[PDB]
């Protein structure tokens, strides 16, 4: 349909020449964040081995950006996600109201089970943790040593952000296959 | 798909009464009309 | 007798229980072992003298033979999580069992379409990943020293490579190709032109 | 013989059992019907592991003792070669006809009347569907390119292809057109080769205009690329139906070596034959030699000095596709080679694929050939087999789109229009066949109701709503929503189904429904 | 130690005959739905796990594996029904089973099997005498060898675009099968060659083979076009001088060397030209063209030669002249020759055609059709093909009866009248055989959708009043005359059916106590 | 429209049990007589 779409744009389109070949250099892209590394070699062996070794160097540099970046642990991040899912459970269509709310319940069961093996009362700590973060104090978490709720920034309890994204993504991929199941086909033994 | 399971089955009890009610209509079915079949009771 | 040769199809009533309760029972094995204070499990064989006790979630799930055909799906999910990182396999199986535990209530007393339940998670997990980004912290602090530590690591990656001819110029190109992104570091944001 | 354990059925019995046997298998595939259905885990006895919702794969793996459901496998085997994507559509439609046939049996109608009842009702629904059908090529040519891309996108939306589908959508269109003629409209699945290997990703999959053969060019020192050699005619390749070795007579086959004298002579004679057989390749000007049998160590020595790469262990079927695509000939003997009998291609090169150690060869052609090999890459073996059959499903949809330029709007709107037209004409047709025509219209309503249940909508409420939109408002095609969108009217979404594809489904469903009614007796012998 | 029956006891008495009757009913009830072209099919799963579905009565009974010894007789007579005849394999078992069912109340009343056998054998003897009166085979009576087959073929050809000209077209269908040996009748020998242009009713039937004019070269109008007893020769490849295809590359540096290979090829053909001269063949036919060298030589010797004849025509050339095919032209031998009575070239269709006509040795004919378009002639070729295939089986067996319950009810009606004049127990026995004949029209109407209760009373009412030829229409349910609609069945099927079914039924009942060992 | 619309079709089929049973109890053909009523009642009104 006309005038309905997602359009891009750029300030200046300039045609340049490098290596006896015409090239195009764009300028002033809208909200553009990116880079283009132009490798100038003396042969094909210098070009192919450089691109493979450059991506390996960029992978090590990107590993330090994604890893060592952590989030507040000790039940904090599990409860913080519950507040955002409950916000998603606020504005929602009819049939998915209980489906979105059920996702926030499993997020609160993660610190509940962690408090089970600690030997404390999970129903008391998780309930107070939800009411604490709901109004202000978004940095609070569960303290398994003293059996109370304390600030995670003061205690220094953090967990990796990459680990959080991996568990949530794997749980969505595992639930994608299993929830669609109206019947189970038993695998052939090898 | 996945729908309401209805763990308790009050409707299945009603369906048993419907089949028992349709069995009475099957007996009266043969008696309909002036040429209908007689019933021995 | 459909299928055959050990292959069979579960009943629609039992398949939903095998995909939920059957998957929870597998998740119950790693449920009490989650966390540093978690409990331990016992793995016993026919000889009974070969047994062992360990809290490892990947060891308990792979060692126990699973006759449940839905349980083999969680084994493949555990292999996907192990490929990413060697830690967190226990937390994924437990969280997946909690999603399936409430899913039983999302069917029986709910009557909600199962694909809409997944779409309900896709919208909920998107807000969950966004909440983790807002609360995300980092040890990257003292970035002025961290930005300098990246150009030295890039020089170490250039060893044994033909790019070792000039370390200062090439490490600056790789360092500026990351920090200047201010976003996703995937190679899709970096174009390579070979001339 | 085999008197015991012999099952026998009669008229008053099997007629009820044949309907229950079809409803068991039908209810199994109703959950996997549509893009919102279930992907089932299937493992072939050959060791292939894959997960797909395709009915042709699921039903083929079904082994059961019910004789009525075996006819579903026999029809799907013949339909898999014609289409292959309509397996779930025909069985549910055939089961809907059988469910309505059982109701007519309770009313006192013979099963042979139901066979002729659905036959006249099917032919009537074809004329009504053709009047409401629309055409592509006679309408817009640029949408014809867009229809072929978005029709494959519908089948590729339920798979991981959905991210990279843009490339595979163009690969599915070119692969079908290459193996067919525009006027003939004949596409054979044997002409399109579907292959794939582990490694790489799906975005790196390439479309090849020629064979593959999975060869490393024998000895590694041989060149990995073949040049045209200063403006020659194509690239000449040798096809040999005889192995490379000194010829031996069929009368004796024995070789006697008396001493080192005859030993050194026979060793040189075998090397002299190697020099005589390679000269026939040089005189004909063949760059690469393709043979059905392996080569010796001395064979790769002489072929390397002359820069003549070698090909070993090629099947008999693969030799036919080489001469057809490269416009070559099958040369039975060695001395019968010549420039006219050699296959001429555009170029020959060895392209390394990711980290895979196979290092196969790619033989392409500039002109349109009769053989196309579709090669798919992926990070996992299950991903390759998933994207391979997903691309093969796109090849089958485009096959029916080019076979008939006229298409119908799918998404459930096709079955509703065919049902409302027959139901209105059912009252005009009097006699006993009136109920056979009304039951046929009610059987067509099972398809949109099944798709409505899998989409999370009321099957009765949505079906009754679509009938009011196509009657009180205006005659058009508005179906149930299979994929998430804002509103109804899939015609606005440009979702089309081939008219020859939908017509092939209703004919096979009626042909099988009649055959099931033509079997009133089941005789199953025991095991001796 | 050695046991013949493996210790398997068997009961005797009147219960053994009842076990034989129930075995015939079990085989009958299976074959009831398979009677008729629209009948139901039986699905059989062998112990080999091979599932087959077919309506053939011979294929079904062989895959059932019937252990019952007396029921094997019904399978044995069915295999002979498919061998000696080929039609009625299912109906002969149903008729023998229904005749067995009619004899069931005779055993309960105490009637011995002797009078039961003699009652049916007398009814069949009176039936065959009535079938010969019902079966109409006419040659010199109000018909000929053609018009008899032309009437039955006209109705099946009726309601077509050729129906107005159908008078001239039906005569060429019967003359097609009469132009060849009546012992071997094949539907592939009637193959029609189309001639574009001309009126549809101007088509001419040819006893021999015809082909178009392949000659684009000058020198025509020389060879004589009329021969008395020409010797026809068949050739394949390598005849003429200059090869049309598959040439050879020969490089010569001199003019005399170029004239040497031309004279060399000339001498090779010249020796082959005299080979036909010494053989004495006046007709030369091959699938390859004939150059000017052979045409000029055969002109002085009055020898006709025609090349580029289609492979479909050359196949009819060999069988028409009674010769054989020769691979090369060097191997030409006199025993391959043949001769017709006449040879001429016709201008029909504004195109000159060379053809053979009036060959007594011709085992195959060729029909030449004319029309305004080739697509219209193609529809006529398919319309005439259906008429020839019907009279083909009618020419093989010229003794036919009216089908569709006509003959079946007339035999039943007369035997009920013959029983009134026959005193004794045979009166009720013959009436049972006449009632047993009612199962044949019954199952045909039940499998086709008709109501066997109504059609049985409506047929008997119309059949017993006025005309005795009234049959049953297979398409639309109604009473009618199958003799007018020309729906026929060969009489040798019903004669052999009443002989095989009644005998096999009389045999099974002939034993009071049967002892059969197992193993 | 909706769920009620399908009930109107089943309610109409449920009203045909009375004339069908009358044809069955009278010895007439069940399926044949019922179709003769739908055929004649199209042109005429309450006349058959």
Curated annotation (Swiss-Prot), chain A:
Domain of life of the source: Eukaryota
Subcellular location per the Swiss-Prot or TrEMBL entry: Cytoplasm
Its job: Molecular chaperone; assists the folding of proteins upon ATP hydrolysis. Known to play a role, in vitro, in the folding of actin and tubulin. In yeast may play a role in mitotic spindle formation.
Subunit structure: Heterooligomeric complex of about 850 to 900 kDa that forms two stacked rings, 12 to 16 nm in diameter. Interacts with PLP2; this interaction leads to inhibition of CCT complex mediated actin folding.
Membership in a protein family: Belongs to the TCP-1 chaperonin family.
The protein, known as: T-complex protein 1 subunit beta
Organism: Saccharomyces cerevisiae (strain ATCC 204508 / S288c)
GN (gene name): CCT2
Covered residues, full protein: 331 to 520 of 527
UniProtKB/Swiss-Prot annotation, chain B:
Species: Saccharomyces cerevisiae (strain ATCC 204508 / S288c)
Highest taxon of source: Eukaryota
Family: Belongs to the TCP-1 chaperonin family.
Residues of the whole record sequence present: 8 to 48 of 528
General remark: Present with 5530 molecules/cell in log phase SD medium.
Function field: Molecular chaperone; assists the folding of proteins upon ATP hydrolysis. Known to play a role, in vitro, in the folding of actin and tubulin. In yeast may play a role in mitotic spindle formation.
The protein's name in its UniProt record: T-complex protein 1 subunit delta
Subcellular localization(s) per the UniProt record: Cytoplasm
Quaternary structure note: Heterooligomeric complex of about 850 to 900 kDa that forms two stacked rings, 12 to 16 nm in diameter.
Swiss-Prot record, chain C:
Keyword ATP-binding recorded: yes
Any one annotated GO CC term: chaperonin-containing T-complex
Places the protein is found: Cytoplasm
Keyword tags: Acetylation, ATP-binding, Chaperone, Cytoplasm, Nucleotide-binding
Gene Ontology MF, one: ATP binding
Keyword Hydrolase set for record: no
UniProt superkingdom: Eukaryota
Primary location: cytoplasm
Annotated family: Belongs to the TCP-1 chaperonin family.
The protein's name in its UniProt record: T-complex protein 1 subunit beta
Gene source species: Saccharomyces cerevisiae (strain ATCC 204508 / S288c) (Baker's yeast)
Gene symbol of the encoding locus: CCT2
Parent sequence residues shown: 4 to 198 of 527
Curated annotation (Swiss-Prot), chain F:
Subcellular localization, as worded in the UniProt entry: Cytoplasm
UniProt superkingdom: Eukaryota
Family per similarity comment: Belongs to the TCP-1 chaperonin family.
Subunit (UniProt): Heterooligomeric complex of about 850 to 900 kDa that forms two stacked rings, 12 to 16 nm in diameter.
Function of the molecule: Molecular chaperone; assists the folding of proteins upon ATP hydrolysis. Known to play a role, in vitro, in the folding of actin and tubulin. In yeast may play a role in mitotic spindle formation.
Additional comment: Present with 5530 molecules/cell in log phase SD medium.
Name the record gives this protein: T-complex protein 1 subunit delta
Species of provenance: Saccharomyces cerevisiae (strain ATCC 204508 / S288c) (Baker's yeast)
Lineage summary: Eukaryota, Fungi, Dikarya, Ascomycota, Saccharomycotina
Underlying gene: CCT4
